[PDB]
Design an enzyme around this catalytic site. Structure first.
Site, mmCIF file in Angstrom:
data_model
loop_
_atom_site.group_PDB
_atom_site.id
_atom_site.type_symbol
_atom_site.label_atom_id
_atom_site.label_comp_id
_atom_site.label_asym_id
_atom_site.label_seq_id
_atom_site.Cartn_x
_atom_site.Cartn_y
_atom_site.Cartn_z
ATOM 1 N N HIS B 3 0.805 -1.226 0.000
ATOM 2 C CA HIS B 3 0.000 0.000 0.000
ATOM 3 C C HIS B 3 0.842 1.283 0.000
ATOM 4 O O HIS B 3 0.295 2.376 0.005
ATOM 5 C CB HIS B 3 -1.028 0.021 1.173
ATOM 6 C CG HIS B 3 -2.018 -1.115 1.152
ATOM 7 N ND1 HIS B 3 -1.731 -2.361 1.675
ATOM 8 C CD2 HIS B 3 -3.283 -1.197 0.669
ATOM 9 C CE1 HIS B 3 -2.777 -3.163 1.511
ATOM 10 N NE2 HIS B 3 -3.733 -2.483 0.900
ATOM 11 N N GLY B 19 -4.646 11.100 10.467
ATOM 12 C CA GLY B 19 -5.639 10.284 9.764
ATOM 13 C C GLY B 19 -5.888 10.733 8.327
ATOM 14 O O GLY B 19 -6.103 9.898 7.413
ATOM 15 N N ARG B 23 -4.021 16.378 5.494
ATOM 16 C CA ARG B 23 -3.301 16.954 6.632
ATOM 17 C C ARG B 23 -1.851 16.526 6.667
ATOM 18 O O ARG B 23 -1.022 17.286 7.151
ATOM 19 C CB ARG B 23 -3.960 16.600 7.949
ATOM 20 C CG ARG B 23 -5.381 17.039 7.994
ATOM 21 C CD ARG B 23 -5.485 18.423 8.562
ATOM 22 N NE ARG B 23 -6.400 18.316 9.681
ATOM 23 C CZ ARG B 23 -6.473 19.190 10.667
ATOM 24 N NH1 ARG B 23 -5.681 20.266 10.672
ATOM 25 N NH2 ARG B 23 -7.344 18.980 11.636
ATOM 26 N N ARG B 42 -3.454 5.071 -3.607
ATOM 27 C CA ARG B 42 -4.752 5.317 -3.002
ATOM 28 C C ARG B 42 -4.969 6.753 -2.560
ATOM 29 O O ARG B 42 -5.971 7.058 -1.909
ATOM 30 C CB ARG B 42 -5.008 4.356 -1.827
ATOM 31 C CG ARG B 42 -5.220 2.936 -2.269
ATOM 32 C CD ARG B 42 -5.398 2.001 -1.078
ATOM 33 N NE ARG B 42 -5.642 0.639 -1.577
ATOM 34 C CZ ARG B 42 -6.842 0.113 -1.805
ATOM 35 N NH1 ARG B 42 -7.946 0.806 -1.553
ATOM 36 N NH2 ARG B 42 -6.929 -1.124 -2.267
ATOM 37 N N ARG B 86 0.963 9.267 16.265
ATOM 38 C CA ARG B 86 -0.312 9.634 15.688
ATOM 39 C C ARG B 86 -0.526 11.080 16.119
ATOM 40 O O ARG B 86 -0.316 11.427 17.277
ATOM 41 C CB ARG B 86 -1.468 8.741 16.167
ATOM 42 C CG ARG B 86 -2.857 9.355 15.942
ATOM 43 C CD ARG B 86 -3.993 8.276 15.980
ATOM 44 N NE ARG B 86 -5.258 8.940 16.257
ATOM 45 C CZ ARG B 86 -5.959 9.664 15.386
ATOM 46 N NH1 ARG B 86 -5.531 9.815 14.137
ATOM 47 N NH2 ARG B 86 -7.089 10.276 15.793
ATOM 48 N N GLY B 88 -3.698 13.466 15.752
ATOM 49 C CA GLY B 88 -5.046 13.448 15.222
ATOM 50 C C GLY B 88 -5.950 14.206 16.138
ATOM 51 O O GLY B 88 -5.491 15.035 16.918
ATOM 52 N N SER B 89 -7.242 13.958 16.016
ATOM 53 C CA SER B 89 -8.181 14.589 16.911
ATOM 54 C C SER B 89 -9.090 13.527 17.505
ATOM 55 O O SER B 89 -9.054 12.340 17.101
ATOM 56 C CB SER B 89 -8.973 15.692 16.187
ATOM 57 O OG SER B 89 -9.798 15.155 15.196
ATOM 58 N N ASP B 202 -14.532 18.464 19.420
ATOM 59 C CA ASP B 202 -15.841 18.788 19.939
ATOM 60 C C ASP B 202 -16.051 18.068 21.246
ATOM 61 O O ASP B 202 -15.194 17.285 21.660
ATOM 62 C CB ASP B 202 -16.947 18.428 18.920
ATOM 63 C CG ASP B 202 -17.135 16.912 18.725
ATOM 64 O OD1 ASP B 202 -16.367 16.086 19.262
ATOM 65 O OD2 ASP B 202 -18.100 16.523 18.025
ATOM 66 N N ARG B 215 -9.275 25.209 16.609
ATOM 67 C CA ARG B 215 -8.723 23.999 15.989
ATOM 68 C C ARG B 215 -7.347 24.238 15.366
ATOM 69 O O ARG B 215 -6.463 23.388 15.461
ATOM 70 C CB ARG B 215 -9.672 23.435 14.930
ATOM 71 C CG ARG B 215 -10.884 22.669 15.471
ATOM 72 C CD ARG B 215 -11.880 22.486 14.321
ATOM 73 N NE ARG B 215 -12.830 21.412 14.553
ATOM 74 C CZ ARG B 215 -14.104 21.430 14.148
ATOM 75 N NH1 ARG B 215 -14.585 22.496 13.491
ATOM 76 N NH2 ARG B 215 -14.904 20.383 14.402
HETATM 77 N N1 LIG Z 1 -8.112 -8.623 4.404
HETATM 78 C C1 LIG Z 1 -7.658 -8.823 3.163
HETATM 79 N N2 LIG Z 1 -8.233 -8.135 2.147
HETATM 80 C C2 LIG Z 1 -7.802 -8.309 0.886
HETATM 81 C C3 LIG Z 1 -6.686 -9.265 0.659
HETATM 82 N N3 LIG Z 1 -6.460 -9.239 -0.664
HETATM 83 C C4 LIG Z 1 -7.344 -8.358 -1.224
HETATM 84 N N4 LIG Z 1 -8.154 -7.783 -0.296
HETATM 85 C C5 LIG Z 1 -9.225 -6.801 -0.530
HETATM 86 O O1 LIG Z 1 -8.760 -5.450 -0.417
HETATM 87 C C6 LIG Z 1 -9.215 -4.802 0.772
HETATM 88 C C7 LIG Z 1 -10.524 -4.091 0.489
HETATM 89 O O2 LIG Z 1 -10.335 -2.684 0.728
HETATM 90 C C8 LIG Z 1 -6.110 -9.970 1.850
HETATM 91 O O3 LIG Z 1 -5.159 -10.800 1.814
HETATM 92 N N5 LIG Z 1 -6.652 -9.690 3.031
HETATM 93 N N1 LIG Z 2 -15.674 7.501 16.802
HETATM 94 C C1 LIG Z 2 -15.619 8.834 16.880
HETATM 95 N N2 LIG Z 2 -14.457 9.452 16.556
HETATM 96 C C2 LIG Z 2 -14.364 10.790 16.622
HETATM 97 C C3 LIG Z 2 -15.569 11.550 17.050
HETATM 98 N N3 LIG Z 2 -15.203 12.841 17.020
HETATM 99 C C4 LIG Z 2 -13.897 12.899 16.617
HETATM 100 N N4 LIG Z 2 -13.382 11.666 16.364
HETATM 101 C C5 LIG Z 2 -12.016 11.341 15.924
HETATM 102 O O1 LIG Z 2 -11.906 11.271 14.497
HETATM 103 C C6 LIG Z 2 -11.760 9.934 14.015
HETATM 104 C C7 LIG Z 2 -10.287 9.589 13.921
HETATM 105 O O2 LIG Z 2 -9.979 9.288 12.548
HETATM 106 C C8 LIG Z 2 -16.810 10.776 17.377
HETATM 107 O O3 LIG Z 2 -17.906 11.281 17.747
HETATM 108 N N5 LIG Z 2 -16.736 9.453 17.267
#
Ligand SMILES: Nc1nc2c(ncn2COCCO)c(=O)[nH]1
Ligand SMILES: Nc1nc2c(ncn2COCCO)c(=O)[nH]1
Ligand SMILES: Nc1nc2c(ncn2COCCO)c(=O)[nH]1
Ligand SMILES: Nc1nc2c(ncn2COCCO)c(=O)[nH]1
Ligand SMILES: Nc1nc2c(ncn2COCCO)c(=O)[nH]1
Ligand SMILES: Nc1nc2c(ncn2COCCO)c(=O)[nH]1
Lengths: 231, 231, 231, 231, 231, 231
Positions: B3, B19, B23, B42, B86, B88-89, B202, B215
């Site tokens: 990846h 994340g 950013r 990706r 990490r 993040g928030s 928040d 922020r």
């Molecule tokens: N978990 C998992 N997903 C896969 C594999 N090969 C292809 N995929 C599918 O891609 C992930 C979907 O976003 C693998 O070995 N393991």
């Molecule tokens: N699960 C969750 N994550 C949050 C919330 N607010 C901020 N975050 C953190 O962002 C997600 C991290 O990628 C929330 O209400 N729920």
């Protein structure tokens, strides 16, 4: 309280929590002045005395989540205890955990169901109070006491045929004892501060025992760290 | 690696892990010199540059345990990354967690099954590397950045009809995000060092939003703490 | 919506859901007319255009249950999306699953805790909308695209040391990906229609890779099936 | 086989599986020619006869996962049965499931532990054989029999104080019976083909009963679909 | 009641519960006077007659937790049955369990999810009514019938690829059948009295079968114990 | 042994197991002749003396599954103890459990994870040794001591916010204590005999306390039953 025969005010804001009530007696008599025993129920002794003019209690917890949970719940709920500090030992499960190391547990894993009972599908990670931990860490560093900060495993079974300590060690876990998960969870649930300071009694995977001299030394370092941290 | 399109040596010993890959781009361009993008697979950008003459990478993780687990596993296994941080928030779940607070997570709870998959009956408590955490803590304190050390909750469902955050808050948990459990577990499993530094976006229980200015400020404090900590 | 920057009406009734937002861009530009990008938040692109005079959107989901759950919840709740179709790939786990086969998932197994969180002791079997599935099946058959209908496994860990795919394969499961359980559950919970169409990127147990030409071909068959099915 | 008193060759490639052995008798006598009873053990009758010159068996399963699992395992392992088709009833749990509807189950949820016993942390989604299902679907459509394709819930407790059918209904589940999970799992595990065709005996949430005439009609449609599908 | 075609008063206070409805018929005809069949629904026969001038019913249960649960719930709820006595067989899993031994189960383990469905984190240990058990025990002892009192395992899968009987045997468990957990739990939940008396049909670990003569003898001892116990 | 300072032969074949080591002392001194204390480790006293010329030991266990498990494992493994008898108290959870009743536990439910750790998907029902139980039952009956035979609940949390005792009571469970599951499981696993005899210290649901006189009386009945049973 059901398991502690003390009168209001007899227990300090800060309680040290050894597992062995004979060690509670030893700590109080060796380290504190003007000692009184406030509890004899079940022979789980508790004592209060002073260290540098400041009140400190020392209360045996017994072994295992269920036993410490009783004492911690009562200390908090009936005696308004603010700082709870476990001073105990553990079986080291990594070679890099040295017999002289004093362990400050940031968190603990467990095979106790206590938190699944409350949370079900959630894995609750208990958490040391950082202020206590950092104070203990500074006090060790100041004097040159060897100290390692990481996690432990709180076990229900001292003799466990299905032990996962091998895998736990590979995930960085330092050692195994029988109390920390309960202490950290119950203190946090009630807005109090908790920390576990642990010595190493052996390496469980090599079966290698720490000597009597080794144990006496680390125990004194643990108690100094526990008290220095809070002065 | 599957990846990440980088060549050996293109990724630093130390990687910051936002994340949001936009950013990651923002952090690299704003904070580092001599920046190169080593990954576009990706659109999950990663970059490498220097801060005070020292190499630093910044890699987007995506959201949720499964996405960060991919990037963390590859960074470790294929690029020999030593320090993973990490940035993040999170959604704060206690009133005492202030919108200006920078959070250093000692540990995280989760409703992800990732650790029950490995351990079954064991609740595995993930653990920050204390050295990174303490450095980050010192760097905040030195400059007067408000900082709180405790635990977070790593959630699988941003929209969770069965959310237990109310109970989690009463147990002292600070806030909810979607990554930390995976980061801390996977780094520890491979003997690497990890830390999550989080801002507050928040309060989830009051629905109260943190302002754009708020922020931007906390984000800059987080990035300073992240970088100062490692210089 | 928190993660999608679109205005009302900008997203079609029918959304295709690739995991990779660069593939969302590729699909829109290659297959649709009069394309607009309605979302750039987090670089998780979404686009809307027409196919044979009918509006169609294409939205990246990211990888893993937690990431797709965000996009699916928002598409449904904020944009009143009626048909949600994952177009992705999977790792085949049986020899009888051929590299040219296009997979229509009737259901998916998972190691995600998302449904145990909601149901506890119940194993919730997610279910494709049969009307979408049958349309997709007819469209494949009409043109002679090789197609296999069965179940997949939605995995939380791309790198899983405790993988059960060997046993899953013996129970007839076709392949492993990271999204379907969430898509099917969340669409059903809100009375919308969902289907996952998957290509084969490799055989995970033999490590044998599908070639670039093979992948380009099956991807085009998947997109044709996805669009033909809904015209 | 332990529970079936038949001699080799006495059981057909294709077996219909009603829960009630008196219904097995009724089906055989009413629909097939040249009928012989090959099993009387436990009074769980099984019969073999012909339909349009093709051999077909009809075997009672009893009620519940454990009972059908016995008969399905023996039919497969000892009699090399290739196609197993449950013909039974269910309690509808949605208003949109009409009393005249014949249900073809794509999959089933369950509160049986049978699959957690095999898979632990995995939720195994059982899967109908698509070829049987599509044939049954075509045969219904050809004659105008009202038919609905979706999932059911396989329950261990007919009288369940902790029933989650309300939540199951909101997730799109059609109705509740006591067999399908076992049939679909065990057939797939051994590379055989399975399908459950179900009539509606009542609406469990409204307590509204389907009339005797209604039941006789749908039962005949189910049996026609079952047989037409395989001619 | 849904599954039992009896009229009020047709079923006695005391019901014997064989798994096999042809054995219910055999017991009634061989042991009781003035027998009437009060149930033919599903061919799961039930009968009522007298033994020494006292009314006694005998009702087939079918195999597995789900099937017996139906009959036990209806007998209790609709027919005010007070004493429910399973008379069945089991596969012995220890060498010290002799083929001639009549087993009185104090409790049973299970892999059925029925009690986790009700209790979640609690392991519910079902319990025989001691008065019935002691009466049965005294009646065996009086006549010299060899009798062993201990626990059994209530299994969902007669053919279980993940069977733990080896470990169960080492924990003292006597044998495996398919009913007791349900009987004991459901009777207790409604304040009624229950007991399971079991013969040994084989040793599952040695594959050694008990002979026809052996089975006929132990079956008669079981029925005598069942009836003597309640006169 | 790690937790017991005795020399070989110092511990009898039969050990009584109170939770409170001060009660172990009280029992030995009050009931036995020629008493010696063989253990002072942790102040968890153990003693050996004679009753009617027969050796008997009395060993404190502490509170909770983890503590008793230590003592029971060591007594069995290191001292070849054959009969282990818990003499303790419990909180009654039904009105029909009278304050004067002596309870003989046939089995116990639990929220301890100890058996799920060993068995996973299996609910292991622990089982008293019937011979000890019946002897204890006969000894009570002979003297007219009121006695009730049924099950108890072994709790990990004396203060449990998620207590299910209300539901446990409706299923017939008599009372709650903190040891029995461990005793019964560990004795059975090693082919030894175990029984728990319990007095009632209160009704937990009514909060009604048993008086000091009431407690002294029932305690003496328990100890008589324990000793009479084994003479
Ligand atoms: N978990 C998992 N997903 C896969 C594999 N090969 C292809 N995929 C599918 O891609 C992930 C979907 O976003 C693998 O070995 N393991
Ligand atoms: N699960 C969750 N994550 C949050 C919330 N607010 C901020 N975050 C953190 O962002 C997600 C991290 O990628 C929330 O209400 N729920
Ligand atoms: N569970 C367990 N705890 C230990 C071991 N060694 C030391 N301790 C810690 O003592 C128990 C704390 O009361 C061990 O091997 N297992
Ligand atoms: N569990 C359950 N099954 C039902 C109900 N109504 C019809 N069926 C299906 O019959 C049982 C299949 O043998 C109900 O209310 N509950
Ligand atoms: N599960 C199971 N039950 C058995 C076995 N042998 C005898 N019985 C008991 O019969 C089933 C009770 O209806 C066996 O091997 N497994
Ligand atoms: N868990 C629990 N145990 C009790 C209660 N009352 C008495 N006991 C039994 O004492 C504990 C055994 O060491 C109670 O309310 N809860």
């Amino acid at each position: 309280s059901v398991h502690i025969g003390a009168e209001k005010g007899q227990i300090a804001d800060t309680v040290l929590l050894p597992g062995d009530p004979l060690r509670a007696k030893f700590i109080a008599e060796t380290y504190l002045e003007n000692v009184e025993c406030y509890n004899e129920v079940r022979g789980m002794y508790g004592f209060t005395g002073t260290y540098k003019g400041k009140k400190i209690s020392v209360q045996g917890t017994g072994m295992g989540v269920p036993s410490i949970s009783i004492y911690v719940n009562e200390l908090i709920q009936s005696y308004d205890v603010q700082n709870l500090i476990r001073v105990g030992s553990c079986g080291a499960i990594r070679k890099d955990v040295k017999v002289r190391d004093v362990i400050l547990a940031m968190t603990s894993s467990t095979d106790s169901q206590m938190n699944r009972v409350a949370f079900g599908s959630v894995d609750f990670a208990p958490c040391a109070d950082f202020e206590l931990l950092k104070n203990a860490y500074d006090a060790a560093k100041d004097k040159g006491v060897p100290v390692t900060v990481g996690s432990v495993f709180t076990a229900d079974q001292f003799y466990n045929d299905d032990s996962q300590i091998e895998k736990l060690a590979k995930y960085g876990v330092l050692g195994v004892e029988m109390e920390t998960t309960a202490l950290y969870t119950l203190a946090a649930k009630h807005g109090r501060k908790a920390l576990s300071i642990l010595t190493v009694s052996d390496h469980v995977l090599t079966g290698e025992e720490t000597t009597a001299e080794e144990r006496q030394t680390t125990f004194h370092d643990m108690i100094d760290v526990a008290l220095h941290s809070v002065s």
